[PDB]
Amino acid sequence: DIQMTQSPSSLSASVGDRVTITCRASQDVSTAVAWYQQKPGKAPKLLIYSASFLYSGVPSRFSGSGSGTDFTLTISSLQPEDFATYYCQQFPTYLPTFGQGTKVEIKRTVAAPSVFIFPPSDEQLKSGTASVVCLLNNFYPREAKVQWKVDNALQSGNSQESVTEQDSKDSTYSLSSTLTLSKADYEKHKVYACEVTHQGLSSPVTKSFNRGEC
Amino acid sequence: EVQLVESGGGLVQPGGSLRLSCAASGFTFLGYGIHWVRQAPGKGLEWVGWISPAGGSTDYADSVKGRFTISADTSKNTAYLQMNSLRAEDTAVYYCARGPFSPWVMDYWGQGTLVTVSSASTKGPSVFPLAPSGGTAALGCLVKDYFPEPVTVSWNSGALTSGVHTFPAVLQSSGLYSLSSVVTVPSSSLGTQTYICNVNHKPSNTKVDKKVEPKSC
Amino acid sequence: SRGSFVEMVDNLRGKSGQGYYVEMTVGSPPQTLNILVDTGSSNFAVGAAPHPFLHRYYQRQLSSTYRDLRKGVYVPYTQGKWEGELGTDLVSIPHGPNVTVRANIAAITESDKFFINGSNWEGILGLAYAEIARPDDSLEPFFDSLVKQTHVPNLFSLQLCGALASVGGSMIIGGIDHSLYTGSLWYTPIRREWYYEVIIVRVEINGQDLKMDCKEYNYDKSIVDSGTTNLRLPKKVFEAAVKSIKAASSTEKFPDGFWLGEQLVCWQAGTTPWNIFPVISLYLMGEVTNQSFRITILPQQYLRPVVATSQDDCYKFAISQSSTGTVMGAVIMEGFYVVFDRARKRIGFAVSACHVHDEFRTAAVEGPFVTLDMEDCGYNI
Numbered sequence A: 001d002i003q004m005t006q007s008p009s010s011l012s013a014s015v016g017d018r019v020t021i022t023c024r025a026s027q028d029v030s031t032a033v034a035w036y037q038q039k040p041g042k043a044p045k046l047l048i049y050s051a052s053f054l055y056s057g058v059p060s061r062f063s064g065s066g067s068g069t070d071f072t073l074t075i076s077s078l079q080p081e082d083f084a085t086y087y088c089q090q091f092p093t094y095l096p097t098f099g100q101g102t103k104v105e106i107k108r109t110v111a112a113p114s115v116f117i118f119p120p121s122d123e124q125l126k127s128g129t130a131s132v133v134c135l136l137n138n139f140y141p142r143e144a145k146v147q148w149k150v151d152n153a154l155q156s157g158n159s160q161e162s163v164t165e166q167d168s169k170d171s172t173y174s175l176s177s178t179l180t181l182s183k184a185d186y187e188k189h190k191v192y193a194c195e196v197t198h199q200g201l202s203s204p205v206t207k208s209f210n211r212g213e214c
Numbered sequence B: 001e002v003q004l005v006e007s008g009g010g011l012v013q014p015g016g017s018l019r020l021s022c023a024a025s026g027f028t029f030l031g032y033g034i035h036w037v038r039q040a041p042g043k044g045l046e047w048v049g050w051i052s053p054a055g056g057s058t059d060y061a062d063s064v065k066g067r068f069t070i071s072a073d074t075s076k077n078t079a080y081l082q083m084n085s086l087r088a089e090d091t092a093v094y095y096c097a098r099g100p101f102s103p104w105v106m107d108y109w110g111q112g113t114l115v116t117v118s119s120a121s122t123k124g125p126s127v128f129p130l131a132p133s134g135g136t137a138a139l140g141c142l143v144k145d146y147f148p149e150p151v152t153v154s155w156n157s158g159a160l161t162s163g164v165h166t167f168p169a170v171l172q173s174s175g176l177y178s179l180s181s182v183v184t185v186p187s188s189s190l191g192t193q194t195y196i197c198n199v200n201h202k203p204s205n206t207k208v209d210k211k212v213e214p215k216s217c
Numbered sequence C: 001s002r003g004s005f006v007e008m009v010d011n012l013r014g015k016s017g018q019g020y021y022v023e024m025t026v027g028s029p030p031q032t033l034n035i036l037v038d039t040g041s042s043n044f045a046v047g048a049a050p051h052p053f054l055h056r057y058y059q060r061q062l063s064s065t066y067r068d069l070r071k072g073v074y075v076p077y078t079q080g081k082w083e084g085e086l087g088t089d090l091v092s093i094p095h096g097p098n099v100t101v102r103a104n105i106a107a108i109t110e111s112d113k114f115f116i117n118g119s120n121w122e123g124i125l126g127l128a129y130a131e132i133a134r135p136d137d138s139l140e141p142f143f144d145s146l147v148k149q150t151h152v153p154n155l156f157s158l159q160l161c162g163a164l165a166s167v168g169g170s171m172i173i174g175g176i177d178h179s180l181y182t183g184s185l186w187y188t189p190i191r192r193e194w195y196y197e198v199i200i201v202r203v204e205i206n207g208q209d210l211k212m213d214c215k216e217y218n219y220d221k222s223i224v225d226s227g228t229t230n231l232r233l234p235k236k237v238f239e240a241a242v243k244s245i246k247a248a249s250s251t252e253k254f255p256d257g258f259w260l261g262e263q264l265v266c267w268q269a270g271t272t273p274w275n276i277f278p279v280i281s282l283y284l285m286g287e288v289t290n291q292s293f294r295i296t297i298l299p300q301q302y303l304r305p306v307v308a309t310s311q312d313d314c315y316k317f318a319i320s321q322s323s324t325g326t327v328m329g330a331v332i333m334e335g336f337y338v339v340f341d342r343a344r345k346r347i348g349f350a351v352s353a354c355h356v357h358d359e360f361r362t363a364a365v366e367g368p369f370v371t372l373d374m375e376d377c378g379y380n381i
Helices: C142-149 C235-247 C256-260
Strands: A004-007 A010-014 A019-025 A033-038 A044-049 A062-067 A070-075 A084-090 A102-107 A114-118 A129-139 A144-150 A159-163 A173-182 A191-198 A205-210 B003-007 B016-025 B033-039 B045-051 B058-060 B069-073 B078-086 B092-099 B113-117 B126-130 B136-146 B152-155 B164-166 B177-186 B196-201 B206-211 C012-015 C020-026 C031-038 C044-047 C067-075 C081-092 C100-104 C106-112 C123-126 C156-162 C166-173 C186-189 C196-198 C200-205 C222-224 C231-234 C265-268 C280-285 C291-297 C303-305 C312-317 C326-328 C338-341 C346-349 C364-370
Touching: A004 A084, A010 A019, A019 A033, A019 A084, A019 A102, A033 A062, A044 A062, A070 A084, A114 A191, A114 A205, A114 B136, A129 A144, A129 A191, A129 B126, A129 B136, A129 B177, A144 A173, A159 B177, A173 B177, B003 B092, B016 B033, B016 B092, B016 B113, B033 B078, B045 B069, B045 B078, B045 B092, B078 B092, B078 B113, B126 B196, B126 B206, B136 B196, B152 B177, C012 C031, C012 C156, C020 C123, C020 C166, C031 C044, C044 C081, C100 C142, C186 C280, C200 C235, C200 C291, C231 C235, C256 C312
Parallel strands: A010 A102, C031 C123, C044 C106, C222 C326
Antiparallel strands: A004 A019, A019 A070, A033 A044, A033 A084, A062 A070, A084 A102, A114 A129, A129 A173, A144 A191, A159 A173, A191 A205, B003 B016, B016 B078, B033 B045, B033 B092, B045 B058, B069 B078, B092 B113, B126 B136, B136 B177, B152 B196, B164 B177, B196 B206, C012 C020, C012 C166, C020 C031, C020 C081, C044 C123, C067 C081, C081 C100, C081 C106, C156 C166, C156 C338, C186 C346, C196 C222, C200 C280, C231 C326, C265 C312, C280 C291, C291 C364, C303 C312, C338 C346
């Protein structure tokens, strides 16, 4: 059972840079090798087959090469839409095994978040529960602190975070935070703030709403 | 148009049986073969099996050997994957991919079908509207307390893909999942253009189209 | 017989696996019809009535110059039989020699797996010799009527180009167009004037000799047949070729029907892996003693395109089994510029202007090699 050790496991480069991903077979696999691209959540697409032959529709900036055990995938001019995890494959003896993957992230300039805040819906409120949501839109880097405040109070252990994978078009991250309270608890408090701290902001931005107002 | 569509994905009991399908369309079924590959959440790929619908010619991996049985219906342009004695280690996204007889590569992959082996139960999601001044306004939909993965979200029947940000599903301490799907739209289009969440939770057969609108305040 | 015939250049059309046809006008007034170029036969026949598979046909009663011989003809095949009623009528080739000939013509009134659904040709032009002309030799073949009644040199060359997918080519009647090929023409003797029979002295796969007796290749004979798509091999030879091919092609996953020519194999358009297929070489008896030349074809030749969906490239094994000897079909003639020198009883081959190749390999006609077998590779007489 042939083995495929890719290297490295992950990397981050700038738009235009020359990125090279290496793959090592635990045995001479001739030229029976392939390379796939896979966006997070989406299916894998074939890029290179037989070590160096590009697949139909695969951009010219993608390049493959190698024989025996040392095969390499090279992306001469890195692009935002090239963000993904890359896998090599072997199939000389018709027992395919892939590499452990290599996530290629994109580096760009600082971008600040667009911060929205959403009240609990009447529909959820109908079931005696209230979910307050904060939304940070299109920012870089990924590092961002989101704190919840209820009448100037520090919340903790009652909220969750979810961050999107790097955008394929502009390479920015969107973030979603959720504060979950009961209908009763949510009804004795007035101000609900969502302080946001990001390298993009010169100072923490707070987006709030006064319950029962507007 | 080349396209594969897997099916049958859902919650399975440990030691249970499940049958996945692979609908082929837009390409010359006979002439290619069909591979089955799987991938755990956050893990890599693992070739499961192969078949030549003209005519099998079936091949498996040691992992699934003796439990998985690959089938093919040339009349229906469909490849099947019978799975038995399903253990927890079997939990993964199951892709079926078109395979040229040589080289033994997969050139077109389907979006796969998620399968989850667990003692837990299936619960549909609770879709809530995420609604709210400038030129652009943010509308969304909170898909709450469902299980198991995954959840598919499109806006306006797919006609709207600009500004959409469907977030990775977070696992709550309650054992249930929850994700968000947002979309920035021209503030002027509010009250002139309708927006709907196309939520779909196949494992639960729960499909929901939730319209999102600014509150009457 | 040796210059530049720009009015015959590119006068051939057809579809992959459906042969090459040329436009010929028959009768008075001139009925324009597409007739397949068939060197593997000697009879000139055309569909005489409406068919589902044909766009047009030969209306005898429309021709004031037509004359019925009130005698019938019938032709068993391999494969595609046909039968009809004999007669004569004026014939001319629009995109060819500016000459008119009164030749024999068989109005086809019945056939089986003969015509091809939407191949845009309704007739067949047997260019071979009268000895194999049905009912018998007495019926003068078209080309025999041509040279006997006009000043057209006893010679015709073909340039099948390929590349259902449409194709094109050239049929030079009377001469040798020197812009249709490069290098030189390597001639192999026409062993006998019935079919365009020759002698294959040696067969190879990726350079490796097939190691079969000389007269295993020519049993009961070897012919050059433009009217046949596939490269037909006698049982033994076919059995060995496919074996050797398998062994040197990394093709263990292909369906078995593929090798029988029943099941197709497809890749994404432009993604076909030619390099995983061997090259086939066929050494032919040279003109001078002990010498022989070889012709080398690629997978692009013996893998012909074949519902069949826009985005995909599909192929069928253009090498099939035979029971009547070797048949060098259209797949063997495409990459080259085959010359039928009837005057000097010889068939020349050369890399045509539309030679098939890629950024690695290419079709070639190479010589001279030595063969001490020569004329004793034949089997019958």
